[PDB]
Amino acid sequence: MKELKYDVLIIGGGFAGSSAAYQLSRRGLKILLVDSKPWNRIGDKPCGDAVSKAHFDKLGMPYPKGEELENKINGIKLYSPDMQTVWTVNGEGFELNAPLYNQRVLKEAQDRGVEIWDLTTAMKPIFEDGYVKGAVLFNRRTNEELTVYSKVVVEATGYSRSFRSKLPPELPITEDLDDKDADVAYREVLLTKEDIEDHDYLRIFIDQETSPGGYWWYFPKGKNKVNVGLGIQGGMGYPSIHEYYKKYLDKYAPDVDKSKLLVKGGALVPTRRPLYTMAWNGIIVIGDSGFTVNPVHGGGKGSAMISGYCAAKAILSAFETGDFSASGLWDMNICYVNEYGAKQASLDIFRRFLQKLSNDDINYGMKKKIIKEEDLLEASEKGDLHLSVADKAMRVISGLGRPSLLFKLKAVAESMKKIKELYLNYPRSPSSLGSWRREVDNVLTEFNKSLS
């Protein structure tokens, strides 16, 4: 078989892989990125396509321009199940043409020295002496099977986790996730018959009956075009999401023209803390493959880009030291936990609480102003549930005259506090990973039982 030598092999060219490629470019490294999809389809996984502007501003990723930016976003309207209470959170963001932006990032990375092979699948790892050392690839453009050696593989295969899942199962980098720690989500993009009211605002609709464990959404892509969809929690035995969509679409999108559909599709999305380690010998995992998605609102394009930024940093450091061991690449973990992972862990707890609340609970809490709509924004910043907020919330619901899980909010805050402390003390080396992990698992196990 043909054998090639690269510094870095990036597997997957979505927001995660393309960010890593972009952030590693113009540095004199020999980099190959591969994706199973043809070029003009790269980036087209079903998504609501909404990304906060802050992520581009902090990472130095290109702003979306032209046909890439479908609609400027100025905030989000959050709807109670009975739709009688709406909370507004203001903030700048973009409704993207995801494939068009994604492909432009890749083409610029390519112009900046990164080699790209589309229609190419990494079929199996090269693994020897405890190290990932590359991949066997099948290039369906050339109908060639190729062996590529790399100092580091960047695993950016999305939810498929189609490379790291083929590594020896004893390795931390092969960590799987519980079925209940992901959503299935489905969306369509449609034209609308009436102008879209406040089209610069996303709409998110909480409802445990029409989207159990997730939510419905209505994300305008223009004055007369909307991305509408829902996500529901996995591992709960729920019926087909396509059947939820058909049944309740009219509730959330009565204005759409069902004859003018531009795109439709679904996929899985992780909703948990990240991989306990995103680094091992000769490999870093990023994006959905590394469980980088915000457990509460399900947004992962922004955090995918953050994970690509951290990966590039750790890899550049590893080429300085010559150390591509787990230890040599460990800054991946330190960087990612700092930038988003600790926040995710806190929100992993909070998610579990939200998914157990009833519609009556959520209607009541929102109507009684259990929190300010402004406290929502502060909490979303680092995923913190502060004392004064929790205490006030408890006083607000103190008149409620039925059993409710809302009264567990104080204990939720306590568990969030516990897990945040653990992530603030992320293991400085691989040799501490195991005992730290068991501490985190114990916090989660104790929390689960508290809600049962």
Ligand X SMILES: Cc1cc2c(cc1C)N(C[C@H](O)[C@H](O)[C@H](O)COP(=O)(O)OP(=O)(O)OC[C@H]1O[C@@H](n3cnc4c(N)ncnc43)[C@H](O)[C@@H]1O)c1[nH]c(=O)[nH]c(=O)c1N2
Ligand Y SMILES: CC(C)=CCC/C(C)=C/CC/C(C)=C/CC/C(C)=C/COP(=O)(O)OP(=O)(O)O
Residue 32 is a binding residue for ligand Y (CB under 6 A): no
Q: Give the nearest distance from C-beta 377 to ligand Y in angstroms.
A: 6
Residue 386 annotated as binding site:
no
Binding mask 323-362 for ligand Y (x = CB under 6 A): ------------------------x--xx--xx-x----x
105 contact, one of ligand Y, ligand X, none, CB 5-8 Å limit per kind:
none
In the bound state with ligand Y, the residue whose beta carbon lies nearer, of 50 and 190, is: 50
C-alpha angle 400-406-407 in degrees, rounded to nearest 5: 75
366 contact, one of ligand Y, ligand X, none, CB 5-8 Å limit per kind:
ligand Y
> Who contacts 266 (Cβ-Cβ below 8 Å, separation ≥6)?
46, 184, 185, 186, 187, 229, 241, 242
Please report which helix (H) or strand (E) contains residue 13, including its range: none
Among 226, 249, 256, 385, binds ligand Y (CB under 6 A): 385
Residue type at 372?
K
**Residue whose C-alpha is closest to residue 156's, from 329, 35, 336, 317:** 35
Q: Please provide the DSSP assignment of 92-119 as one string.
A: EEEEE-HHHHHHHHHHHHHHTT-EEESS
Residue 288 is a binding residue for ligand X (CB under 6 A): yes
- Token pair of 65 as six digits: 């321009």
Please report which helix (H) or strand (E) contains residue 272, including its range: none
C-alpha angle 149-154-160 in degrees, rounded to nearest 5: 110
Residue 162 is a binding residue for ligand X (CB under 6 A): yes
Among 17, 93, 134, 328, binds ligand Y (CB under 6 A): 93
**Residue whose C-alpha is closest to residue 412's, from 396, 428, 389:** 389
Among 31, 78, 119, 241, binds ligand Y (CB under 6 A): 78
Among 204, 311, 315, 342, binds ligand Y (CB under 6 A): 204
Q: Give the nearest distance from C-beta 186 to ligand Y in angstroms.
A: 10
Phi-psi region of 399 (alpha: psi -120 to 50; beta: other; left: phi over 0): alpha
Among 8, 21, 34, 314, binds ligand X (CB under 6 A): 34
Q: Please provide the DSSP assignment of 355-411 as one string.
A: TT--HHHHHHHHHTTSS-HHHHHHHHHHT---HHHHHHHHHHTTT--S--GGGGHHH
347 contact, one of ligand X, ligand Y, none, CB 5-8 Å limit per kind:
ligand Y
**Residue whose C-alpha is closest to residue 367's, from 410, 387, 397:** 397
Residue 55 annotated as binding site:
yes
**Which parts of 114-143 interact with ligand X (CB under 6 A)?**
121-122
Residue 242 annotated as binding site:
no
> Who contacts 424 (Cβ-Cβ below 8 Å, separation ≥6)?
342
In the bound state with ligand X, the residue whose beta carbon lies nearer, of 286 and 329, is: 286
**Residue whose C-alpha is closest to residue 367's, from 399, 390, 391:** 399
Among 249, 304, 385, 440, binds ligand X (CB under 6 A): 304
Binding-site positions read 15-16, 35-36, 45-50, 55, 122, 288, 297, 300-301, 340
Binding-site positions for FAD read 15-16, 35-36, 45-50, 122, 288, 300-301
* Positions in the binding site for ligand X (CB under 6 A): 11-17, 34-37, 42, 45-51, 121-122, 156-158, 160, 162-163, 185-187, 229, 266-267, 269, 287-288, 293, 298-302, 304
